[PDB]
Design a protein around this ligand. Structure first.
Ligand SMILES: OC[C@H]1O[C@@H](O[C@H]2[C@H](O)[C@@H](O)[C@H](O)O[C@@H]2CO)[C@H](O)[C@@H](O)[C@@H]1O
Ligand SMILES: [Ca+2]
Length: 769
């Protein structure tokens, strides 16, 4: 490997060999169908709300999130980079697709597949990833840096449906070598959203932008229709001319053929026919190819940038609503703007790289923090783009000031903004994109007094329940299969209108968002204040025995939605205490004296009774009435964790908090698989995992990272990082279970998982508070 020295890959990048087989991979541990797309994954490309494309470590464009809210894992084999090299003096050159695999059928059989093992590496530090190609049959070594401009405090470039592929080529040998790099792409209009005639009318055009010193050649792959529908739009690939390279192209090759129409040209001398052809296709799939060719002398390095854009302006959800995607604000809504997007990227990518370096640098340059922590911190952010992210710029046929936003809990449980989960998972938004965060919280504020008296069947018990109760915060803002933002509470496994954590978590999120954006946004507190008071007042009514604390009802009435709580729980009780203290402080800020007094009174009574009911001398009991009420719960003091972040002080005695955290580390971490897999949710006082429910026997990745932040704040530095390390190890390490770029909700002791591609582990960002 002589190419790594010519590029700048951070030491904390996650790494794997191109073509590497992984032997230890985990699988779903449930009986019902659950997504398992394998360990062949990579860091995604594409902005927030743009739809994303997962290009894997083997080189294939395979994990398709272009249909917003959906996950489709299938390799589109025409989409590749390929290389040609010929040493000066030799008769023939060699050509190779940079993909460690081959197609299933005979399409593209003429191409040179099966990029060999031990001939290159993949690296990822989101939003960047890299491939290096160090092949004994390729004398010129190549590397590519690929990224989308995902930039904190930037809501413009961060939305773009674009990727840049910055190539570096170096000749370490003593002979001149002719080199070509070719980008191929299938015209994917009709890949989704089209029931019949899926390729019909697709056509490719070549754009030559010859502005002085900024020459770009691109293919625009669209459809002759000017219809404005979810399926229609354009894809573009292209390249910027640099000194010493020539550009060639082929407008149209057939993807549902042997591919020799293209490959016979490329494999000969790395130069394409430059044949423009706008003839639309009928049944055949078609694609385009953009290539560069150059001669590298001994010791010479050259850099050349390619790009990919996709202008698919409309997202449709299963309930029938069509919305424009956020980036349409910047490029238009007609779906004929892919070149404009591509051109912006090709002309500004160096600026974007610097903007990304500028935001990563404070963390990467901190030599007190281990590399592994940096690996997890940055790579967990993949989910902000890859979580079915929806960000609207108007309903089709509709103008509002704000742009509604939603991130999925996951794909298996296809619910937008699940509030009990976002309590953990929204840290990156408040810390890095706070205008999005506050918009999402205003969305929740607006739902507080919505009433929907129509009934739904509760999955867990078959009982009928009211969809949405006035004064109760919703579980979620809908499903991509139905009507995001419009029909809330798509979740039906339990009835969230009786949950004991949602209303408290809502208040805690509101106050968090004020505190972590500098305690200046009084406007945000004013907007949400009525909903905060309502939320707490309603939850107070669920106190059955006048101890001042809502009563869990002997069912799963909170985020651990198969794990029953009864009476006063440590989890919901501590959240309640903290929410009361937050509301007191908001009351002070807004000069609502009567609110301050009321919530202070409730707080004092509840605090006294919580301590008396649950403090056992070593930790806080799980709850007051369950069969295993004395279980040690990893999340028992979630309210105090948030109180630390919100700077609300002690809600429970410091001595008791420290004892509880030490107990959790000693038991839930260190007695669970030697502390190498995170914190198991429930452990019995005898050091055996609690078997009352499956969720007690799971490590929750987002709970464990949040617990690590709690330990860190409380000075338990070694414990914090050791606790988090197990989650990193399972996700990323060779000894783990192969969950990179699909971190799950949970795993059991065998390492098998539930719900890959999950929002909650974004809570790792709570470690940066
Ligand atoms: O629906 C989300 C919810 O699913 C729970 O799993 C259920 C599943 O929905 C149901 O179809 C199947 O028959 O039973 C399982 C429970 O065993 C899951 O446990 C929840 O955590 C999740 O929120
Ligand atoms: Ca009570």
């Amino acid at each position: 490997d002589k190419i790594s020295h010519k590029i700048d890959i951070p030491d904390s990048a996650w790494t794997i060999g191109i073509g590497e087989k992984f032997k230890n991979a985990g699988h779903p541990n449930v009986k019902y169908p659950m997504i398992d797309d394998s360990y062949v994954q990579g860091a995604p490309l594409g902005g927030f709300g743009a739809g994303t494309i997962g290009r894997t470590y083997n080189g294939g464009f395979s994990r398709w999130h272009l249909e917003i809210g959906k996950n489709k894992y299938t390799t589109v084999y025409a989409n590749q980079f390929s290389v040609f090299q010929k040493v000066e003096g030799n008769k023939d050159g060699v050509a190779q697709v940079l993909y460690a695999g081959e197609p299933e059928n005979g399409y593209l059989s003429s191409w040179k597949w099966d990029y060999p093992k031990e001939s290159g590496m993949y690296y990822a530090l989101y939003p960047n990833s890299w491939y290096t190609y160090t092949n004994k049959d390729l004398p010129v070594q190549l590397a590519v840096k690929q990224f989308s401009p995902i930039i904190p405090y930037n809501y413009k470039e961060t939305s773009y449906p674009v990727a840049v592929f910055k190539w570096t080529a170096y000749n370490p040998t003593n002979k001149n070598v002719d080199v070509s790099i070719m980008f191929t792409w299938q015209n994917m209009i009709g890949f989704f959203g089209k029931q019949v005639n899926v390729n019909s009318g697709n056509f490719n055009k070549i754009i030559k932008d010859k502005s002085k010193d900024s020459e770009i050649v691109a293919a625009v792959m669209g459809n002759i229709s000017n219809d404005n529908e979810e399926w229609n739009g354009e894809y573009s690939i292209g390249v910027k001319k640099v000194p010493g390279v020539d550009i060639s192209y082929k407008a149209k090759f057939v993807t549902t053929g042997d591919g020799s129409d293209l490959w016979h040209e490329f494999s000969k001398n790395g130069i394409l026919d430059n044949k423009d052809d706008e003839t639309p296709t009928k049944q055949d799939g078609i694609g385009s190819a953009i290539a560069v060719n150059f001669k590298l002398q001994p010791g010479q390095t050259i850099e050349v940038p390619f790009a990919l854009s996709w202008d698919l302006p409309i997202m449709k959800f299963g309930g029938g609503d069509k919305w424009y995607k956020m980036y349409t604000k910047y490029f238009g809504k007609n779906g004929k703007n892919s070149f404009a997007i591509l051109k912006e990227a090709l002309n500004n990518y160096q600026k974007w790289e610097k903007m990304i370096d500028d935001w990563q640098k404070p963390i990467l340059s901190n030599k007190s923090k281990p590399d592994w922590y940096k690996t997890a911190l940055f790579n967990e952010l993949y989910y902000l783009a890859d979580g079915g992210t929806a960000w609207e710029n108007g309903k089709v046929g509709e103008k509002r000031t704000n742009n509604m936003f939603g991130l999925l809990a996951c794909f298996d449980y296809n619910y937008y903004e699940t509030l009990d989960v976002r309590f953990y998972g929204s840290f990156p938004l408040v810390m890095l994109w706070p205008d999005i965060e506050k918009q999402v919280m205003r969305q929740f504020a607006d739902t507080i007094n919505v009433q929907d008296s129509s009934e739904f069947k509760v999955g867990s018990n078959g009982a009928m329940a009211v969809k949405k109760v006035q004064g109760m915060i919703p579980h979620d803002l809908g499903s991509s299969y139905a009507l995001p933002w419009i029909k809330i509470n798509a979740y039906d496994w339990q009835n969230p209108n009786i949950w004991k954590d949602l209303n408290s978590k809502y208040v805690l999120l509101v106050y968090r968002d004020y505190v972590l954006t500098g305690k200046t946004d009084k406007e945000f507190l004013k907007y949400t204040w009525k909903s905060v008071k309502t939320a707490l007042d309603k939850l107070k009514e669920m106190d059955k025995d006048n101890d001042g604390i809502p009563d869990n009802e002997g069912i799963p009435d909170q985020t651990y939605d198969t794990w029953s709580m009864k009476g006063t729980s440590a989890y919901c009780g501590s959240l309640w205490l903290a929410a009361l203290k937050a509301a007191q402080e908001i009351g002070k800020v807004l000069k609502d004296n009567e609110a301050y007094i009321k919530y202070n009174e409730w707080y004092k009574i509840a605090q006294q009774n919580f301590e008396k009911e649950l403090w056992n001398g070593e930790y806080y009991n799980f709850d007051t009435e369950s069969d295993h009420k004395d279980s040690i719960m990893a999340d028992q003091l979630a309210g105090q964790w948030y109180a630390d972040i919100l700077r609300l002080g002690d809600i429970l005695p410091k001595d008791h908090v420290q004892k509880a955290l030490k107990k959790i580390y000693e038991f839930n971490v260190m007695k669970f698989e030697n502390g190498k897999m995170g914190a198991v949710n429930g452990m019995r006082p005898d050091g055996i995992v609690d078997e009352s429910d499956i969720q007690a026997q799971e490590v929750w990745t987002g709970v464990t990272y949040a617990l690590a932040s709690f330990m860190k704040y409380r000075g338990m530095t070694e414990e914090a990082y050791n606790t988090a390390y197990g989650v990193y190890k399972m996700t990323y390490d060779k000894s783990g279970k192969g969950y990179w770029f699909r971190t799950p909700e949970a795993w059991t002791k065998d390492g098998n998982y539930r719900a890959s591609m999950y929002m909650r582990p974004l809570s790792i960002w709570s470690m940066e508070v």
